[PDB]
């Protein structure tokens, strides 16, 4: 009877790497959004360029204030300068539902394919 779907259905995460270029993606169900401020990306045994988060839209919470959020889909490129064998990228994010529901933060571990420094 719940109108709030499982976290992985509201925020469907995926990734694709091609050597030095990595793209992180989230398909965001209509009526849900991600908090730009809650995104954290951490490399393990890899060196990445500083990630620029894109400009999203705005949301207001009566007592909490305004926050920059993302709807529909979020595409985040990451540049992998180097990555040793078995390197990983820890990606953490958090979102909520407009009708009134807050999901806790979620963390995904991305196995990076090896990349020798250029």
């Amino acid at each position: 009877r719940s109108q709030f779907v499982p976290a992985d259905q509201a925020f469907a995460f995926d990734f694709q790497q091609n050597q030095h270029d990595l793209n992180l993606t989230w398909q965001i169900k209509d009526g849900y959004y991600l908090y730009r401020k809650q995104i954290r990306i951490t490399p393990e045994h890899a060196k990445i360029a500083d990630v620029q988060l894109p400009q999203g839209v705005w949301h207001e919470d009566e007592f909490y204030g305004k926050s920059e959020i993302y709807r529909d889909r979020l595409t985040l490129p990451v540049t992998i300068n180097q990555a040793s064998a078995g390197a990983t990228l820890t990606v953490t994010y958090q979102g909520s539902a407009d009708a009134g529901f807050c999901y806790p933060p979620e963390t995904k571990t991305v196995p990076l394919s090896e990349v020798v420094a250029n």
């Binding site: 719940s2 976290a7 909490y64 909520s96 807050c102 999901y103 806790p104």
Partner: protein, 136 residues
């Protein structure tokens, strides 16, 4: 396994949760604006004599304690689930959430989203009366 919020290292016996009678379990978090939105109604409902347990969800104790201070503490039992393990086996996946647990510790209803007059006086109360009576 029922850790106290107001007193870090204190645990309660499962029995204390329901004490042989129906009870409402409310999942809340300072980081969830919807928890703030439903809190006053919760205060009232607990004012009407409905027993409600509190489960602070993957939150900060200092903030959580401060929160109940400025907004009121409608819980007869206030719990802390920082690791979110307790919520995991109750099937909690966000806040706010309110569960109806009968006198035998069985979950009889789960509602994800704010608790309000409509949801109680239309989805929970009838089940509450049933299990309250069923606890002769």
């Amino acid at each position: 396994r029922l850790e106290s919020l107001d007193n870090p290292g204190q645990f309660y016996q499962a029995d204390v949760l329901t004490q042989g009678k129906p009870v409402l379990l409310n999942v809340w978090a300072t980081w969830c604006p919807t928890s703030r939105a439903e809190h006053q109604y919760l205060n009232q409902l607990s004012a009407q004599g409905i027993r409600v347990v509190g489960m602070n969800y993957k939150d900060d104790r200092q903030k959580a304690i401060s929160w109940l201070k400025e907004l009121g503490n409608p819980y007869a039992l206030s719990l802390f689930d920082g690791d979110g393990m307790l919520g995991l086996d109750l099937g909690v996946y966000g806040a706010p959430e309110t569960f109806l647990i009968d006198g035998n510790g069985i979950i009889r209803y789960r509602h994800a989203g704010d608790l309000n007059p409509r949801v109680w006086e239309e989805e929970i109360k009838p089940l509450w009366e049933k299990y309250s009576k069923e606890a002769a």
